[PDB]
RNA sequence: ACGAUCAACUUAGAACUGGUACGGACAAGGGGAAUCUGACUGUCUAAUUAAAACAUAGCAUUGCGAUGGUCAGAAAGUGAUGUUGACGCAAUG
RNA sequence: CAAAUGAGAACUUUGAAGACUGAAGUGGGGAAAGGUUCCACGUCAACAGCAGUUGGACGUGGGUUAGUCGAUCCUAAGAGAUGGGGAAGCUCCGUUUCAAAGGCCUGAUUUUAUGCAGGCCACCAUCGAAAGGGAAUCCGGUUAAGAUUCCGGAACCUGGAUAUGGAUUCUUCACGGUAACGUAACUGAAUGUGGAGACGUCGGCGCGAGCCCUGGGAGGAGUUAUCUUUUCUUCUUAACAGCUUAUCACCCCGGAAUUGGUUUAUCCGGAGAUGGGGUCUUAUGGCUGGAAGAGGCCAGCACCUUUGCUGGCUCCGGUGCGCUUGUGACGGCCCGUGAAAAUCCACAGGAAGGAAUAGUUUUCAUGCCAGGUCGUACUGAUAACCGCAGCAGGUCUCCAAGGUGAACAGCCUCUAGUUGAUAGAAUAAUGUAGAUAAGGGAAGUCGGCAAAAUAGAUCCGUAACUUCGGGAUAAGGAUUGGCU
RNA sequence: GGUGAACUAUGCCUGAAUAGGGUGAAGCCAGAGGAAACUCUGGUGGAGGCUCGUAGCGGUUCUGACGUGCAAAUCGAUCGU
């Protein structure tokens, strides 16, 4: 139940580009046309319009994510270190 | 004259053949064909009663 | 076969210069210039297609009566029924909980 | 152009009233010595490119 | 360029008081293979419109043609 | 010689910006009464792509406090802005993702983007996407606010300017290798004429500092003067050092 | 456990047959072992050079936080970048 | 080849034959450009590198008909006044800027008006597309030459006035449906808001239009030494008006694991699937009207003469990975996500006004009037444009039959068009273009230059190396018709 | 001191054009082997600045024709895409 041992999604640029940048750009090319969550209505209808763009497609919702991920990690450290800070001037 | 010989089957050996397989008669065409014919098949069998919507389904992955 | 022409100045296939092949009394292959069709209106707080309205160009539909343009029901031929049952939802339930709210802060500040 | 502006039909006009040959009394006229139309035009030889 | 249906609607339509002239064509048509029977087409010319009266019954439209007002000009062909 | 590209390229003939497909240019709030006294409410009606720009814009709409209006700001996403997100806008605003607070009433530490250079400017800094700005510190006496900028310089703000708080979406687009000229030249077709780019050695010497020669080189040291002009300014302006560094952030 | 209209073009097989011919005209890859060189697709000396040259993605360096960098203008209450903001713009290799 | 015309014919006209273009045409039209080249009559001094009776030549004239096609209106990139600022200045910048920047609703409304103590607001001039956006027309006929422009018929839009019928009204501004929503109507200012305008590309799938193919039947033509219930050919239905017609979407009942439904493509369901029942968009098709009265195919009538008339028929189907076009629901791509404005409609709100022998409704039906200006002929190219020319060059686009075949190349043929390029005789060398060759097989040559060989499809088989994607059609073998 | 972007270079705006094949990426469905981990197979689908090759765009070689040319750059074959 595999056509490609290794190249994946990026079988389509043949030989061309060298192996090293073709991988990287797998890894960014799984991301950017995976499927996702949505927080919203719990279902995976979430896809990448354009670099930035979430949009759901049953709850017909838009967010504002990472270029290749719905969600990024510096997104999420930036939202706890944010949720921290207003606890801390709130109480 | 040609038509009706050809349906009588002749003219179409592998000296009368110019273009590959896919390219005289796609195999998606052929597949869509026998595709539709078994899911019409399950649908009308299900309809009848003849089977169950379980192997219904069940046939349905299958084919 | 009949091969037909623009019966317009315009020869190039843009998209207001559209064709289609008509037979005619006479018996001849003659061009019939189509127009653009028309989109459905859409709701403006959802976006979906709006039911019950007619599909006409812009002026066109200055031409038509009033009953093609809307629906009976408030925010008729502007917002779906869904949307609408939403927002009517939305704005009893909040204004209740407006009052809420307010009660609340009153009894806590006569507790205070 | 078939799409003309009335400007260059008038030009169009204008050129077509011009281009015809002498009229044949002129020449019997005294002290005459105009014998042609030695501004007359055709259409493939000059262009008047306006 | 408009249907008519009832005797009623034609006799309000050539009673409209813009209406002058009534064109009366005969259709012989067929509604059963051995059965080729004669179909009147009653077309009133209102200012905006052409409304026409199908009726498949000769005695119906002898009827009409008798019942329209002398004054209206009736043309038959 | 002749006129050098770089030269060229201030006249603005055909390197001026590609601005058809964009969005409207991306501005906070103005600052009028309520930014800078309590908040207001906006909604984000959608969120969009904008064409030359990394980062996704945000159309929030505001009540018009003074007449009976509808006010539309196009704001900078920041990530996790959603559509139907009530955004708050103001001195009394709290601490969420999506909110315009002044950087006198953030606290040290905060995570800002779109941040004002002045009180009222609408927005300067770190609005790239996936950039941000860190808040350092406070002098409250002559209201100054310490930050860092998303290249490692700190700056010294006035309390009053805005700033969203968050990172702004579409972080992490420059880690996707492009591969391909194409993608080069469909990225460039909506920024502007700068791509591709002829090498200076690959000229003539009318056309570039570079050019000319028997063989492919510079010549003179590539590192230019400050003082230089306009056509010796090709290479290496102002260089402190030059060389592959093994270094650090370092800020 | 099973019946009837409705002839639609694909595939495979078997004899038979012929001056062994049959993609019967047309249409239609020569192939292999290597060396030098440029990664590739792309571009240019219109009218003697299409290349190994240019470009390219990738890599690296440089300047600049806006009262700024780079560039324009005789000047300007003037401009390009810039509807821009370091994941950017500008300059190089 | 033969007639005709003519002083004169290889070249003009007509007839016959042979051919070609072969539907990304040598066909039918247009855009830029040209400018009368269009058409008729007369005519051949010059021009058509031969000729000429012919012509895009010469002479004389005729011809272009619009509310509906365009322009006109809008805005795009952009250009560009004003205010203001530079510059000795010609002028430069600037286009909402450090401006006191206007037009738009209803009363005032003939002691005076279009004044004003009525009211609303606050755009940045303007130009910029004959392929972008847009109010509205089709069929048949008609000329020597114009026609979506004329005529006949049949409609539509915009702007005006405007009465009648219908609807509503003592429950003042309608009712029905659980609902999606329906209907002939069924008040709606300021102000606000929302839609349409309004958008890439590719792929398969579905549907429709035309075309292609095909059966029966009703006419005409061809072939008929023999055969062929045969071959070719007509059997058409416009805009516009009503009824009907839909994938998608949505609503009601209901409450799902034994998970079911389901597409070619794997998505969808306790945020409510399956199932039953419905609502809407009208792409699109069907029926009727238009409309058989038209067009077309046939047969016959008064005997030179710019003459018509009368009879029939114009019908019923089928098929498909078919071609092309349009549409639909989808799927892929992007650090690329694929105009704006005029304009039109709608909604929120409720200003204002309104009874009864009559008020309102001109978003329901009918009825009345008008629609200006400029373009419109023709070519669009191996002769109408540019290249000094009637130049083998260059120059944007629409339609697109049969067979072979994978195939809008290659070959042949229908419709349509052309048969134009100075000719006659002969067949030396040397050439240009196309070929073949014994035996050898690169010995030729700077060098396999040039040519030859290979070649489609089916099956088998396929190495080193590799960035695991390729290499690869590697290499290397076999087969190929016709008939039953 | 003036005139040229009707050729051409580049950007922008608004339009238009591009048969038929080969290969067969992701996604998805079914099956087999295995104690398991997992592996393997058959389909489906239709990716690519992929490939053969029309129209188109270009211009490698013949150092072919021509070279007082059809032509102040064309013609034919062969070619690139």
Redesign the pocket.
């Known amino acids: 139940?595999?056509?490609?041992?290794?190249?994946?999604?990026?079988?389509?640029?043949?030989?061309?580009?060298?192996?090293?940048?073709?991988?990287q750009?797998k890894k960014?090319?799984?991301q950017?046309?995976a499927?996702y969550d949505?927080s919203?209505?719990?279902?995976?209808?979430v896809?990448?319009?354009?670099?930035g763009?979430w949009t759901c497609?049953?709850?017909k919702k838009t967010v504002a994510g990472?270029?290749?991920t719905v969600s990024?990690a510096?997104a999420a450290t930036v939202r706890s270190t944010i949720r921290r800070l207003r606890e801390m001037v709130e109480a | 004259a040609?038509?009706?010989?050809?349906?009588?089957?002749?003219?179409?050996?592998?000296?009368?053949?110019?273009?590959?397989?896919?390219?005289?008669?796609?195999?998606?065409?052929?597949?869509?064909?026998?595709?539709?014919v078994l899911?019409?098949l399950?649908?009308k069998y299900?309809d009848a009663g003849?089977i169950?919507?379980?192997?219904?389904?069940?046939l349905?992955?299958?084919? | 076969?009949?091969?037909?022409?623009?019966?317009?100045?315009?020869?190039?296939?843009?998209?207001?210069?559209?064709?289609?092949?008509?037979?005619?009394?006479?018996?001849?292959?003659?061009?019939?210039?189509?127009?653009?069709?028309?989109?459905?209106?859409?709701?403006?707080?959802c976006?979906?297609?709006?039911?019950?309205?007619?599909?006409?160009?812009?002026?066109?539909?200055?031409?038509?009566?009033?009953?093609?343009?809307?629906?009976?029901?408030?925010?008729?031929?502007?917002?779906?029924?869904?949307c609408?049952?939403e927002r009517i939802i939305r704005a009893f339930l909040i204004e209740e909980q407006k009052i809420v709210k307010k009660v609340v802060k009153e009894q806590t500040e006569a507790a205070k | 152009?078939?799409?003309?502006?009335?400007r260059?039909?008038?030009?169009?006009?204008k050129?077509?009233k011009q281009?015809?040959?002498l009229?044949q009394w002129i020449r019997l006229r005294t002290n005459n010595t105009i014998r042609y139309?030695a501004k007359?035009?055709?259409?493939?030889?000059?262009?008047?490119?306006? | 360029?408009?249907?008519?249906?009832d005797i009623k609607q034609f006799l309000?339509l050539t009673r409209?008081?813009?209406?002058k002239?009534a064109?009366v064509?005969?259709?012989?048509?067929?509604n059963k293979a051995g059965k080729?029977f004669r179909?009147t087409?009653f077309?009133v010319?209102?200012?905006?419109?052409?409304?026409?009266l199908?009726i498949n019954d000769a005695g119906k439209a002898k009827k009409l043609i008798q019942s329209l007002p002398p004054t209206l000009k009736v043309?038959r062909? | 010689g002749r006129?050098?590209?770089?030269?060229?390229?201030?006249?603005?003939?055909?390197?001026?910006?590609?601005?058809?497909?964009?969005?409207?240019?991306?501005?906070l709030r103005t600052l009028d009464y309520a930014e800078r006294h309590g908040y207001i409410r906006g909604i984000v009606?959608q969120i969009?792509?904008?064409?030359?720009?990394?980062?996704p814009?945000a159309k929030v709409?505001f009540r018009?406090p003074y007449?009976?209006?509808?006010?539309?700001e196009?704001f900078?996403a920041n990530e996790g802005v959603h559509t139907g997100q009530f955004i708050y806008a103001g001195k009394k605003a709290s601490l969420n993702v999506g909110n315009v607070l002044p950087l006198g009433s953030v606290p040290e530490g905060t995570i800002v983007?779109?941040?004002e250079?002045?009180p009222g400017?609408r927005?300067?800094?770190?609005?790239?996407?996936?950039?941000?700005?860190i808040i350092i510190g406070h002098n409250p006496d002559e209201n100054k606010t310490r930050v860092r900028?998303?290249?490692?310089?700190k700056?010294v703000?006035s309390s009053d300017a805005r700033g969203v708080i968050g990172?702004?979406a579409?972080?992490?687009?420059?880690?996707?290798?492009?591969?391909?000229?194409?993608?080069?030249?469909?990225?460039?077709?909506?920024?502007?004429?700068?791509?591709?780019?002829?090498?200076?050695?690959?000229?003539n010497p009318v056309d570039?500092?570079?050019?000319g020669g028997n063989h492919?080189?510079?010549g003179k040291a590539?590192?230019?003067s400050?003082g230089?002009?306009?056509?010796?300014?090709?290479?290496?302006?102002?260089?402190?050092?030059?060389?592959?560094?093994?270094?650090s952030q370092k800020t």
Not at chain 2, 52 to 58: G, M, Q, S, T
């Open positions: 139940a595999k056509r490609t041992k290794k190249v994946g999604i990026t079988g389509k640029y043949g030989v061309r580009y060298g192996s090293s940048l073709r991988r750009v960014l090319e799984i950017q046309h499927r949505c919203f209505c719990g279902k995976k209808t896809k990448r319009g354009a670099a763009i497609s049953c709850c990472g270029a290749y990024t510096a | 040609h038509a009706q010989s050809k349906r009588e089957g002749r003219h179409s050996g592998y000296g009368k053949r110019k273009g590959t397989r896919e390219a005289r008669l796609p195999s998606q065409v052929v597949w869509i064909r026998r595709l539709r899911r019409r399950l649908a299900r003849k169950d919507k379980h192997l219904y389904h069940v349905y992955k299958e084919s | 076969a009949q091969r037909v022409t623009f019966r317009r100045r315009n020869p190039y296939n843009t998209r207001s210069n559209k064709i289609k092949v008509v037979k005619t009394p006479g018996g001849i292959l003659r061009a019939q210039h189509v127009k653009k069709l028309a989109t459905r209106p859409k709701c403006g707080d976006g979906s297609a709006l039911q019950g309205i007619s599909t006409l160009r812009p002026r066109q539909y200055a031409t038509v009566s009033k009953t093609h343009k809307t629906v009976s029901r408030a925010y008729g031929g502007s917002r779906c029924a869904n609408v049952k | 152009a078939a799409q003309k502006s009335f260059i039909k008038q030009k169009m006009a050129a077509k281009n015809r040959p009229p139309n007359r035009r055709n259409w493939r030889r000059t262009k008047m490119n306006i | 360029a408009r249907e008519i249906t309000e409209r008081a813009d209406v002239t064109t064509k005969i259709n012989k048509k067929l080729p179909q087409k077309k010319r209102g200012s905006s419109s052409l409304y026409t199908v043309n062909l | 006129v050098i590209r770089n030269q060229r390229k201030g006249a603005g003939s055909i390197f001026t910006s590609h601005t058809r497909l964009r969005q409207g240019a991306a501005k009606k969009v792509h904008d064409s030359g720009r990394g980062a814009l709409v018009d007449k009976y209006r509808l006010r539309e196009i900078i983007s779109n941040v250079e002045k400017d927005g300067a800094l770190a609005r790239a996407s996936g950039n941000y700005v900028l998303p290249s490692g310089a700056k703000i990172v702004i579409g972080g992490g687009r420059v880690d996707k290798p492009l591969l391909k000229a194409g993608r080069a030249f469909h990225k460039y077709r909506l920024k502007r004429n700068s791509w591709p780019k002829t090498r200076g050695v690959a000229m570039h500092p570079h050019g492919q080189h510079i590539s590192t230019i400050r230089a002009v306009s056509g010796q300014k090709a290479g290496l302006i102002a260089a402190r050092r030059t060389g592959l560094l093994r270094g």
